């Protein structure tokens, strides 16, 4: 069966517009599957970069109390809070102070954390060649600054900081601005919009500015699960205080996952439509071929083979054409996918216009990884559509012999 179909394809080399009837279908399948592969690789790269650049540094959840700032280690115990589902926890100080330096200024949400607790809790390294995290202790009261914020203030590794700090008072003495400048400890790079808000101070030293004692706000979670966060974050009562509503990792950055999945579905459907159009092309060439080789189909009928073989012959013909197109497309897609970031950088340099804005996007560069199961899915769907297209000429291949 394979002999007749395969020699039918390679046989038609003279006449029949060889350079306009088959290479065109090959190009159609190639662009279709190649761009779909590139898109899926880009989406998988987005998932990987989101997991290793947002999930590893953002707290997996938050606990808050509308009452006085102290929640744990003064009024309650975080050890009671540890229940099956949470990997670790550490108290965090939500300390918004904002920074102005005259002509230069930006908005930051200063945060107070113990270096050992954050090192054990979540993977948030200094992300700089300086590697000053080991020196970042409750000593000289150094302050971490994000790259975008440091860029705004035009500050560097070692210098003073024009940080503005507020004061609190129970309705006795209000509006008494104060400023303390101690030091700056490196940068904190994520190549995302988070780099313009984060600024970290040792928790013990942070308590020395906000005038209280042994009192820390909530925000103490680190969760081994990364999707069940919305459910088991409801672990209040172990600290009492307020249990009406506590912020979680859902909502603040949960829309990113929804967007990634939705883009995947849209791109998949659109490229399946592309493959369907190319299958229209191949069914057209199939019906033309069966009209051309009607005499041969007649003589094969004269020589035995029943209705089945001719159907099989032309189904194999169409499937072979589609398979060649899909193979060319998938090899192009694989070779271009593993070099996606270099080629995007190349075209960005040539165009001279940054494709992804660091201001609004969290990547600043286009990632890509290949899963080698998406490729199998691509070939499966391409061959299935090719067979579906080939079905009709198969039925219109049982023509009675003209003579």
């Amino acid at each position: 069966s394979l002999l007749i179909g395969l020699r039918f394809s390679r046989g038609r080399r003279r006449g029949g517009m060889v350079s306009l009837i088959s290479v065109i279908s090959t190009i159609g399948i190639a662009l279709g599957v190649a761009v779909l592969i590139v898109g899926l690789s880009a989406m998988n790269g987005f998932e990987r970069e989101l997991n290793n650049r947002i999930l590893a540094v953002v707290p997996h959840g938050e606990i808050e109390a509308v009452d006085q700032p102290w929640t744990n280690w003064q009024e309650a115990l975080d050890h009671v809070q540890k229940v099956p589902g949470i990997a670790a926890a550490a108290p965090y100080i939500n300390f918004t102070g904002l920074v102005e330096s005259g002509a230069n200024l930006r908005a930051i949400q200063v945060k107070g954390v113990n270096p050992q607790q954050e090192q054990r809790l979540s993977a948030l390294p200094s992300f700089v060649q300086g590697d000053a995290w080991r020196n970042f202790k409750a000593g000289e009261q150094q302050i971490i600054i994000g790259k975008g914020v440091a860029d705004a203030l035009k500050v560097k590794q070692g210098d003073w900081v024009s940080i503005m700090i507020p004061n609190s008072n129970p309705e006795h003495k209000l509006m008494q601005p104060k400023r303390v400048r101690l030091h700056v400890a490196g940068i904190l790079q994520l190549s995302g919009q988070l780099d313009h808000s984060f600024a970290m101070i040792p928790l013990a030293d942070a308590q020395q500015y906000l005038d209280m004692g042994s009192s820390v706000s909530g925000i103490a979670l680190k969760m081994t699960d990364v999707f069940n966060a919305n459910k088991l974050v409801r672990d209040a009562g172990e600290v009492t205080n307020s249990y009406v509503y506590i912020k979680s990792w859902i909502g603040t950055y949960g829309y990113m996952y929804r967007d990634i999945q939705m883009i995947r579905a849209i791109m998949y459907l659109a490229m399946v439509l592309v493959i369907g159009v190319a299958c229209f092309n191949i069914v057209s060439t199939l019906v033309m071929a069966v009209k051309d080789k009607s005499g041969d189909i007649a003589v094969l009928r004269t020589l035995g083979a029943k209705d089945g073989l001719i159907r099989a012959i032309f189904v194999w013909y169409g499937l072979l054409a589609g398979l060649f197109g899909s193979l060319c497309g998938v090899i192009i897609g694989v070779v271009v996918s593993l070099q996606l970031t270099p080629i995007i950088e190349w075209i960005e340099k040539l165009i001279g216009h940054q494709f992804l804005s660091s201001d609004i996007y969290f990547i600043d560069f286009l990632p890509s990884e290949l899963h080698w199961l998406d490729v199998f899915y691509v070939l499966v769907t391409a061959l299935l559509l090719s067979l579906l297209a080939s079905w009709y000429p198969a039925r219109r291949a049982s023509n009675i012999d003209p003579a």
Partner: protein, 218 residues
């Protein structure tokens, strides 16, 4: 001792404008007895081959086969009879371009066999039977049209033949080999009985054999 006659006739599908072919057909093929027809098939007589052999359904009357009327069976069943017993050459031009002649002759056996190994062996021994060992493994279009019919007959008889509805056995080749095919066809008769019914219009060999009939309009 087999009828082969059912007073069958064929007409066009409409029958009001287009004409028809000769009426009250009376084949008497019977067993493996050789026949020859020279009744000027150029006027149009190939329609019987479209009926005799189950190529197309006849408008009126049927054909009695070896032991059962093949017209009263499924096309799948009919195709099996055509492959196993009947051998056709006709004038389909028997051209499989881009398909090598060695496999081309073996095609009817290549529709399924107990052991693929010996299918090729039958092809070569028929090529030497017709004398076509030279230039066997190459395209038929490359080969001249003189040997085009030489390989054509082999495909008809490569399978074990019992009915051979041969048309134009001479081809366009020399009279020495044109007459020698009778010796070649006679050799197969020595092996076992096999019918050779020929419909042509060339009168050179019309009287050359026995059991010759003629029917153009009756």
């Amino acid at each position: 001792i087999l009828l082969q006659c059912d007073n069958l006739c064929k007409r066009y599908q409409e029958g009001s404008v287009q004409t028809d072919v000769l009426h009250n057909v009376s084949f008497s093929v019977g067993e493996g007895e050789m026949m020859a027809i020279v009744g000027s098939s150029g006027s149009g007589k190939s329609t019987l081959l479209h009926l005799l052999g189950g190529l197309d359904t006849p408008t009126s009357g049927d054909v009695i086969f070896n032991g059962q009327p093949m017209s009263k069976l499924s096309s799948a069943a009919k195709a099996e009879l055509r492959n196993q017993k009947l051998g056709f050459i006709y004038q389909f031009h028997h051209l499989l371009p881009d398909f090598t002649a060695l496999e081309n002759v073996a095609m009817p056996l290549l529709i399924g066999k107990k052991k693929p190994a010996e299918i090729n062996s039958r092809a070569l021994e028929m090529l030497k039977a017709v004398g076509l060992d030279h230039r066997a493994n190459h395209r038929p279009s490359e080969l001249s049209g003189g040997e085009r019919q030489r390989v054509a007959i082999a495909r008809a008889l490569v399978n074990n033949p019992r009915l051979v509805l041969a048309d134009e056995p001479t081809g366009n080749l020399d009279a020495r080999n044109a007459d020698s095919i009778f010796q070649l066809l006679g050799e197969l008769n020595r092996l076992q009985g096999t019918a050779f019914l020929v419909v042509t219009h060339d009168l050179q060999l019309a009287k050359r054999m026995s059991r010759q009939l003629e029917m153009r309009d009756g």
